[PDB]
Amino acid sequence: GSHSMRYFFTSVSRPGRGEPRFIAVGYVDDTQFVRFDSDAASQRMEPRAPWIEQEGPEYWDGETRKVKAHSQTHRVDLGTLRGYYNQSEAGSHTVQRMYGCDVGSDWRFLRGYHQYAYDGKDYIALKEDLRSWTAADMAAQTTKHKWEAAHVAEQLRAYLEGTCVEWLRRYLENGKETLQRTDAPKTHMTHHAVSDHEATLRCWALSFYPAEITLTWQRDGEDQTQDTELVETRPAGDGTFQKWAAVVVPSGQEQRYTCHVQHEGLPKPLTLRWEPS
């Protein structure tokens, strides 16, 4: 199937004393593989998946130097933005950045991203052409003008289409046993009476990977959205995901209702019905 590599960075200023709190995480699809936390003791980029542990010292030295360089840019950025927005040195502010690449089933470049937020709102983002910038406001327009004069997008496009894609293919190969394995959801239906004349039927999807999934209810073969509840997909904590969808039904009418599960690990969608007895 399709694959992606993404890095997420968050820097939060601490105006009372010292430098910002900086947290960086790298992902291959839905699997975290590296992390850096400015509050941790190592002061190094650390592994979070077994397939990355095999990389040598030159890799870890290089990723540590780069992640510390990203930390220092975010520290400077917090100061720059405070100035652009005419804000005081008293409050805490946040800068977030995300970048990465997507590849198709052939492992060839599909899309690249590189975007920023300030205090949780869009600041500047690289357009899908990987040549131009979207600046949300006049402060971001000042950054856009600087980045255009400095060939920033040229370097980003080279990284996103080349380096990013090449290393993604390497990680996919080294981590093939888990990264290229799809875990189809283990599904079941539970029944919870809400009174003597109504019940909730809850359709569960457990232990699946990747996180993307669709759960839908039908009544007499027609889509049902009323009296329905769908929880957000959530991590199980062992690398897999969970989700459930529920419907309130008149007791005795359970057999008209079917739950439909769609996931990359399923060649055909699954259909679930309540087993009464």
Binding site: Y7, G26, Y59, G62, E63, K66, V67, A69, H70, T73, V76, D77, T80, L81, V95, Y99, Y116, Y123, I124, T143, K146, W147, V152, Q155, L156, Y159, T163, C164, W167
Partner: peptide, 9 residues
Amino acid sequence: VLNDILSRL
């Protein structure tokens, strides 16, 4: 791997 690009706001 991370990028090795200087990109200040």
